[PDB]
Swiss-Prot record, chain A:
Domain text: Cells lacking the TE domain are unable to produce methymycin, neomethymycin, narbomycin and pikromycin.
Gene: pikAIV
Residue span relative to the full protein: 1 to 34 of 1346
Note: Type I modular polyketide synthases (PKSs) catalyze the step-wise condensation of simple carboxylic acid derivatives. Organizationally, type I PKSs are arranged into modules, wherein each module is comprised of a set of catalytic activities that is responsible for a single elongation of the polyketide chain and the appropriate reductive processing of the beta-keto functionality. A minimal elongation module contains an acyl transferase (AT) domain, an acyl-carrier protein (ACP) domain, and a ketosynthase (KS) domain.
Protein name: Pikromycin polyketide synthase component PikAIV
Function of the molecule: Involved in the biosynthesis of 12- and 14-membered ring macrolactone antibiotics such as methymycin and neomethymycin, and pikromycin and narbomycin, respectively. Component of the pikromycin PKS which catalyzes the biosynthesis of both precursors 10-deoxymethynolide (12-membered ring macrolactone) and narbonolide (14-membered ring macrolactone).
Amino acid sequence: SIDDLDAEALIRMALGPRNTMTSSNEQLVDALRASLKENEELRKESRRRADRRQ
Amino acid sequence: SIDDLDAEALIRMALGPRNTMTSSNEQLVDALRASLKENEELRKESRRRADRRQEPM
Ligand code: NA
């Protein structure tokens, strides 16, 4: 019964798994990109403080 | 021809896009998780280094 399906399943029905897997991967890439930028910033902050501390 | 294809294309030829996209997804989840955990560890390290009492010299 379609009433029992969640949004993810409805979307896949309408757009197909190639589309939904592609969007999932794009979003994962956006998330990982953001996380690695935060990693870069944390490392920069750490280096500045090591320098401050001598 | 097959001789001109790079590795990624050979794997897709043999396994198809559902398999290769699924593998990419799984690697991306793994990478995301590792990146977020690493960030947490760096934040912990900065708290520890803020206490300069244990500072090597
Ligand atoms: Na310390």
